[PDB]
Design an enzyme around this catalytic site. Structure first.
Site, PDB file in Angstrom:
ATOM      1  N   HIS A 155       1.040  -1.593   0.606  1.00 32.81           N
ATOM      2  CA  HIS A 155       0.266  -0.011  -0.479  1.00 32.81           C
ATOM      3  C   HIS A 155       0.748   1.388  -0.124  1.00 32.81           C
ATOM      4  O   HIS A 155       1.600   1.260   0.884  1.00 32.81           O
ATOM      5  CB  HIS A 155      -1.365  -0.006   1.066  1.00 32.81           C
ATOM      6  CG  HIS A 155      -2.204   0.655   0.806  1.00 32.81           C
ATOM      7  ND1 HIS A 155      -2.581   2.057   0.641  1.00 32.81           N
ATOM      8  CD2 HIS A 155      -2.885   0.012   0.031  1.00 32.81           C
ATOM      9  CE1 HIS A 155      -3.939   2.187   0.369  1.00 32.81           C
ATOM     10  NE2 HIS A 155      -4.333   0.804   0.404  1.00 32.81           N
TER      11      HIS A 155
ATOM     12  N   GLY B 240      -0.430  -5.201   1.820  1.00 28.14           N
ATOM     13  CA  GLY B 240      -1.549  -4.642   0.528  1.00 28.14           C
ATOM     14  C   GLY B 240      -0.944  -5.879  -1.180  1.00 28.14           C
ATOM     15  O   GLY B 240      -1.786  -6.213  -1.633  1.00 28.14           O
TER      16      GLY B 240
ATOM     17  N   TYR C 171      -7.348  -3.868   9.381  1.00 24.72           N
ATOM     18  CA  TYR C 171      -7.894  -4.184   8.497  1.00 24.72           C
ATOM     19  C   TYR C 171      -9.017  -5.114   7.787  1.00 24.72           C
ATOM     20  O   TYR C 171      -9.654  -5.088   9.082  1.00 24.72           O
ATOM     21  CB  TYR C 171      -7.133  -5.757   8.431  1.00 24.72           C
ATOM     22  CG  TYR C 171      -6.255  -6.054   6.492  1.00 24.72           C
ATOM     23  CD1 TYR C 171      -5.260  -4.864   6.021  1.00 24.72           C
ATOM     24  CD2 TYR C 171      -6.533  -6.585   5.380  1.00 24.72           C
ATOM     25  CE1 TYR C 171      -4.834  -5.205   4.792  1.00 24.72           C
ATOM     26  CE2 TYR C 171      -6.347  -7.117   4.273  1.00 24.72           C
ATOM     27  CZ  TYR C 171      -5.105  -5.860   3.725  1.00 24.72           C
ATOM     28  OH  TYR C 171      -4.739  -6.012   2.272  1.00 24.72           O
TER      29      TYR C 171
END
Ligand SMILES: CC(C(=O)NCCNC(=O)CCNC(=O)[C@H](O)C(C)(C)COP(=O)(O)OP(=O)(O)OC[C@H]1O[C@@H](n2cnc3c(N)ncnc32)[C@H](O)[C@@H]1OP(=O)(O)O)=[N+]([O-])[O-]
Ligand SMILES: CC(C(=O)NCCNC(=O)CCNC(=O)[C@H](O)C(C)(C)COP(=O)(O)OP(=O)(O)OC[C@H]1O[C@@H](n2cnc3c(N)ncnc32)[C@H](O)[C@@H]1OP(=O)(O)O)=[N+]([O-])[O-]
Ligand SMILES: CC(C(=O)NCCNC(=O)CCNC(=O)[C@H](O)C(C)(C)COP(=O)(O)OP(=O)(O)OC[C@H]1O[C@@H](n2cnc3c(N)ncnc32)[C@H](O)[C@@H]1OP(=O)(O)O)=[N+]([O-])[O-]
Ligand SMILES: CC(C(=O)NCCNC(=O)CCNC(=O)[C@H](O)C(C)(C)COP(=O)(O)OP(=O)(O)OC[C@H]1O[C@@H](n2cnc3c(N)ncnc32)[C@H](O)[C@@H]1OP(=O)(O)O)=[N+]([O-])[O-]
Ligand SMILES: CC(C(=O)NCCNC(=O)CCNC(=O)[C@H](O)C(C)(C)COP(=O)(O)OP(=O)(O)OC[C@H]1O[C@@H](n2cnc3c(N)ncnc32)[C@H](O)[C@@H]1OP(=O)(O)O)=[N+]([O-])[O-]
Ligand SMILES: CC(C(=O)NCCNC(=O)CCNC(=O)[C@H](O)C(C)(C)COP(=O)(O)OP(=O)(O)OC[C@H]1O[C@@H](n2cnc3c(N)ncnc32)[C@H](O)[C@@H]1OP(=O)(O)O)=[N+]([O-])[O-]
Ligand SMILES: CC(C(=O)NCCNC(=O)CCNC(=O)[C@H](O)C(C)(C)COP(=O)(O)OP(=O)(O)OC[C@H]1O[C@@H](n2cnc3c(N)ncnc32)[C@H](O)[C@@H]1OP(=O)(O)O)=[N+]([O-])[O-]
Ligand SMILES: CC(C(=O)NCCNC(=O)CCNC(=O)[C@H](O)C(C)(C)COP(=O)(O)OP(=O)(O)OC[C@H]1O[C@@H](n2cnc3c(N)ncnc32)[C@H](O)[C@@H]1OP(=O)(O)O)=[N+]([O-])[O-]
Ligand SMILES: [K+]
Ligand SMILES: [K+]
Ligand code: NI
Ligand code: NI
EC number: 4.1.1.-
Lengths: 260, 260, 260, 260, 260, 260
Positions: free
Chosen positions: E65, E109, E139
């Protein structure tokens, strides 16, 4: 004792009377916290049935969610620990029957609150509105589900999409109310039924109420569908229209909605 | 032939008439086993529609569960192969419409039995009660679910929490009944509808009935929720109140419930 | 702009009027393709409410599924992309309220179509029937589910198993209709409700509508249950009865169903 | 202090050590009550990771359910509030990671208990058995589900149907264990992993653990399926085989099962 | 045709190579929008299989991410239209197999992204970690679910609670990876398998992939459980620890978490 | 006796040996009818375990579904009443353990058949393939679900998208097989385990097997999801590629799939 409610118990029945008329019994955090404390204090074996009521002669049973306490800062207005969300869970999980005894007009969250209770007995002059489309509020899935167990889908969509009040006669006809009586018979009719229920087997009533609660919630979906719905709700509570709904209410004017 | 029912066939329509007036058509094992054998025998292509009825003139359609066969102590009274649980599953799985033609008073498990059938046509003088809270019985999930597909939650909770009888007129108004007719027209009216259904496509009727059964049942929950409900029901059938309810029924006195 | 519908807009309200009177507004692919194009073209920020109607004076609102377009030879007649299945999804997913304004008689798939809409306002002289058992058609799970959110199970089973028309007055009583008005008042009454809805918050309306749609669908089953149903439906579309039901309609005679 | 466990804290890591060696750490009510009290007392912000262990050098980690406390009396042996059922729920809802550190043999309910924990680190000499088919016990849905989230269906069924012990090496290979280490390294390997986890974000850990718990439980069924399983379980706990299995264990002889 | 990816087509196989080396193929919106465009552009009948890869020789496959783009303060970082949430839906719904061909280190991610793809073939030197507990991130349910279809619960909890890297050898042993090969053989092995898949029936492959997707998602829950989890998620993304996790990452220092 | 299977009983264990070498034990209707009759004939209390096997020395364990009995196009090839669909339900519902004892190659539906059994013990030379993508066949949801309870999603997708055979050694490593043994040891290794299971409590085994069955099936979806999947499967069984797949097998040639 309580600041915002008055409790009277006779024999096995407890009447919880709202004491917040200077704010038309709006569902403020301080009002709901006192209502929940009063219900918790009544969770004793010698109490068998609860009645919720507004004072005798009330024009307004409850004005619904306190519009001043709605967040306008890009936060969910109907999150799990919001007062409206807490009181509907607590009513539904409470191991005694809860009867809403309604005199006066019922608005928005207060309509959901009485729909979450076990029976509704109403005065012939009482009226009922569901108001989120007046404010641009994205009602939550649990809140919407609480409105779908009595009247059919077409009737529920009329109530929500128009936000128009319906009469106690129509609310009886479509399956929302148990009984409609003349206001001068409301207390006697409701106390007769509450005291009758209190002679029945409380443990059987409690487990049957819990079975109904579970079956009523047992509409299941996958995580993607819930997250997709939450994204749609977020776009609504991030909207110009949601700010306009709240602004119009506190400026005492009609909102102008535009679809953004 | 059967000891406890009388069967007549008129073209494609079969009428099953209770023959257990000795015990007011209580859902005893010997009565239900004959009723189920009669239905099974009628599962033939040339039979298209079933009517269940008490004899003409009956004061009591059915007095409900045989209280003398209800398990005493800590045994589940509404287990999977209890007669009431067997006959409701058989009615719902049967590939032909089953019409309950009701004359007289309907009690407890017999009310759940007619609710599990496809259509209810009743005499203007018939009455309906749901009675587990009189006896302290923890009604089972499947049995409660069978009571929730016609009238709304608030109405269902009034019926179960009060155990009070309702008229045929109110049972029509809240959506429990299809039609109410004068008792002298009940047979003629019901047979005319049964013969009319019998002209329609039976395989289409059967698959649509099964689609509605599956959709009706499709309220799903996890194992923990079911085991939690089962633990609550066992606490009820282990309670002093359950013993008191059974005893009070047998001794013909008002029960004294105490909440344990 | 469309061969088979006429669209007029009045401020924020669009009226989609059927123009297929030579086939009594039967749900032919060409008609439904035009109805879906008209709806898609109206998915605009300046449009807030839709009304579906037949022309003023219509004796027949819609004659339902085009029976010439149903497959004969052992093919599912209600597959996911058949026109009736497409239009009900599109109505249910459409982010504006859709009101069915009904004058005349409503048949079969046309009844499912109006049930899939948000509100139904009808003329006092309008009539409603659900017809698959006339033809031997194995209706699909989604289609049947769409008929179960307004009236109760006993009422729905009477409508489907008899295929007999009900009046506007009975459809109101059982929860299918929102309002019944004299035909001379039908357009003005429906337009004033649509204009009123058009001033409410469109984004709140769209997310509540979608929440109702997914709660309405959230009756869940395992794969084996769905495949067992599909096997039963295939036995029906493979049957002699299905061919006989289609044949009898085309030959304008009483079908003779035999149960295979 | 606690009679049946010893608690040590090393900064953010707590070690709960069994102290019931005279009954091979069998899961009696008094032992489980003490373990649940010790866990509840450790539910504090300064504690971040729990380790469950038997004393150093234990040949038997836990002998499983106390067979003297299994009811024989036509009563469900694994009801919701039985100690094994309470401890697995508490381990799973506990907002900190719980690591099972295993030395010695693991039996029956004790195997389910370590399976309900978050990680399992084991001595190379440890062994594992699931034993209800030795006794004739109808294991409950929740309990069986707790055994199905690590190894595949074929492996689970071999373990249950054979009741044969597997090695630590086989338990690692099939996905039951996280790590296998020589017994001399077991304590340090486990503590370093616990201290490492204790440096991470505790609120993130807790919500991800809770998300995994509800996804793990989210295998849903209808009421009829649950009631049908419960009827089958009752037939097993009413069986002669069940009595034979309990008696054989207590008398230390081979049971003779006959299938009723 | 793309700034942030390169596409090579070999017969019916398309190889999509990341071209975002400036941020080590971090999941920035600009990179993910180009990856989704390239995938969409490959949804053609003559393309039968996709390979996703980092450039040959990459130390880092993807750094996960983009932490500079994650919303801080009280905004959900993993909302429905966040780039990581879009790319995993698109990969899972894509009607062709998508093979992740992995050289280098895979983080957070990016690990969820390769777990959402159909097959993973990795270099023997590749490494894998799941990192939200290093940052204090709550999450989301769908993201967590995406991690539970390959290795067992105990292994997934070790990966998430430790945020420690695992080797390709261990990832193969616990069922995360299909194959591990020497880096010199990675292209040859992966392309041979992709070419083989491309000679098979594409419409059978697409419908089976979609059957697996919906069976994988079919862990269902009620609205109350979803809203409860979302409330817990909101408490984490409102926490001081969440701000500390983000600040510590940006200041390249060790976070100090305190449990609020 | 049976035309297509040979049954031997050794104490409490029954061995069903395929006798259809002429079509390599392909799952033709008449073969599966005798396998099902042989299972039903063995549903007696003195039988406690079943082994399914091919004859000693078989090169092919089973060549899978009888391709010649698949429909030519326009019909669902894997409807609820299909022989493969019947045998997997019967194996899963059978109240005794069923062990697949595998010698030789296992193809397609025969791979699903052994996956539906309780345990798999295989020869070191045995091989396993999943084949619908070779023929263009749209596998059904129940059939795919039967392949997902042992190996992870990535492994299952490799198996199905490649249709490549895997070794017994790989099938063991990924969790499909319980045990691999040299072919000379296979029969007595498998009988030892079956005799051992046969001394355990059969009622406990039966209710645990059924609990695992219903938990395995408890992945639930709404009607619209299922009918969407069915429509996609219909597009496949209506495709040119499906007819090409069937023709290529008949003509013993490699198919040319084009994606319509
Ligand atoms: C869950 C939900 C929800 O609960 N929404 C809130 C729904 N409530 C409403 O729409 C009712 C809002 N209020 C009204 O319609 C009227 O106030 C009504 C209840 C009929 C009472 O009319 P009445 O003439 O007797 O008194 P009003 O002059 O309208 O107003 C009396 C005063 O109470 C205030 N007030 C009324 N309701 C509310 C409320 N719900 N929150 C905050 N203030 C309120 C008005 O702003 C006035 O404020 P102020 O001028 O003293 O500062 N939702 O989704 O929207
Ligand atoms: O007062 P209310 O009518 O509200 O309710 P209940 O007192 O429970 O009911 C009035 C009486 O009707 C009886 N009843 C209950 N169910 C039914 C029924 N389905 N039909 C006729 N009577 C019924 C009750 O047993 C009471 O018996 P009993 O006390 O007269 O012997
Ligand atoms: C599922 C469920 C359920 O089905 N419970 C049972 C619901 N049934 C009832 O509550 C109705 C009980 N019975 C009555 O109310 C009355 O018998 C009634 C139906 C009004 C008919 O009165 P009627 O005067 O004509 O005859 P009764 O004097 O009341 O009663 C005549 C006899 O029938 C017995 N009896 C009546 N109903 C039942 C029953 N359901 N089970 C066993 N015995 C019964 C009475 O105990 C009397 O015994 P005995 O003294 O002759 O030995 N539940 O959860 O409770
Ligand atoms: C989903 C579903 C479904 O939608 N089934 C179809 C349900 N529809 C129906 O049962 C209505 C069938 N039609 C009728 O009942 C009558 O046509 C009726 C609507 C009362 C109108 O009566 P009317 O006396 O005016 O008859 P016509 O005006 O002449 O109707 C003109 C023509 O329309 C045909 N027709 C009527 N309805 C339909 C239809 N749904 N499909 C095809 N043709 C139709 C008639 O057979 C006539 O054929 P033809 O004489 O030109 O060769 N289902 O499951 O069954
Ligand atoms: O007898 P019942 O009225 O109970 O049921 P039906 O006979 O089907 O209903 C009486 C007639 O209404 C027709 N009908 C069916 N649906 C409708 C509808 N929506 N509107 C008007 N008539 C209808 C039937 O086709 C019958 O005509 P026909 O076939 O006899 O010419
Ligand atoms: C939920 C569940 C369950 O938990 N079942 C229980 C599963 N437990 C077992 O199968 C353990 C069976 N026990 C054994 O295999 C051995 O006792 C054992 C665990 C290996 C250790 O053997 P060791 O040779 O050291 O000691 P033993 O001589 O067998 O036994 C030492 C004593 O502990 C008793 N005991 C052992 N396990 C248990 C138990 N679970 N409950 C009660 N007593 C037990 C024995 O009966 C002896 O009692 P007593 O005759 O002295 O009064 N289930 O479904 O079955
Ligand atoms: C969903 C999720 C998630 O995805 N979390 C993020 C997990 N990712 C990580 O923990 C890896 C973060 N990045 C790193 O540790 C290191 O870059 C590492 C991969 C070890 C490689 O170190 P190396 O020294 O070779 O390269 P760097 O100089 O650190 O990184 C090269 C450039 O990419 C930027 N970058 C690297 N990773 C990221 C990231 N995840 N987000 C944003 N920028 C990043 C760096 O800031 C550098 O930019 P700049 O300073 O030149 O402007 N989660 O829940 O936490
Ligand atoms: C559910 C599913 C499914 O189960 N599909 C079927 C999957 N099965 C397969 O792909 C295997 C197809 N067969 C083969 O690959 C080969 O026959 C193989 C099993 C390797 C054995 O090769 P081998 O050279 O020894 O022997 P063959 O002569 O090929 O085969 C012996 C005879 O049985 C026939 N046969 C073999 N498998 C099948 C089958 N599955 N269906 C019908 N006939 C079959 C052959 O066509 C021969 O017919 P004929 O030539 O005597 O008329 N699916 O979705 O596809
Ligand atoms: K009005
Ligand atoms: K684009
Ligand atoms: Ni429902
Ligand atoms: Ni699952």
């Amino acid at each position: 004792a309580y600041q915002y409610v008055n409790v009277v118990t006779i024999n096995k029945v407890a009447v919880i009377e709202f004491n917040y008329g200077r704010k038309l019994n709006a569902l403020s955090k301080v009002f709901i916290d006192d209502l929940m404390q009063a219900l918790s204090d009544l969770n004793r074996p010698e109490i068998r049935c609860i009645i919720l009521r507004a004072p005798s002669g009330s024009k307004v049973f409850s004005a619904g969610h306190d519009i001043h306490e709605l967040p306008s800062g890009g936060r969910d207005p109907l999150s799990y620990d919001d007062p409206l969300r807490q009181i509907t869970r607590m009513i539904q999980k409470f191991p005694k029957p809860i009867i809403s005894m309604v005199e006066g007009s019922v608005w928005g969250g207060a309509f959901e609150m009485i729909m979450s209770s076990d029976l509704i007995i109403a005065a012939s002059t009482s009226t009922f509105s569901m108001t989120p489309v007046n404010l641009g509020v994205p009602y939550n899935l649990v809140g919407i589900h609480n409105l779908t167990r009595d009247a059919g889908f077409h009737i529920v969509k009329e109530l929500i999409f128009t936000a128009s009040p319906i009469t106690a006669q129509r609310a009886l006809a479509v399956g929302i109310l148990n009984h409609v009586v003349e206001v001068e018979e409301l207390e006697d009719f409701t106390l007769q039924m509450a005291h009758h229920i209190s002679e029945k087997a409380p443990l059987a009533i409690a487990v049957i109420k819990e079975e109904l609660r579970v079956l009523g919630e047992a509409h299941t979906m996958n995580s993607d569908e819930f997250e997709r719905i939450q994204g749609m709700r977020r776009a609504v509570y991030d909207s110009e229209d949601y700010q306009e709904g709240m602004n119009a209410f506190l400026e005492k004017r009609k909102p102008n909605f535009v679809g953004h």
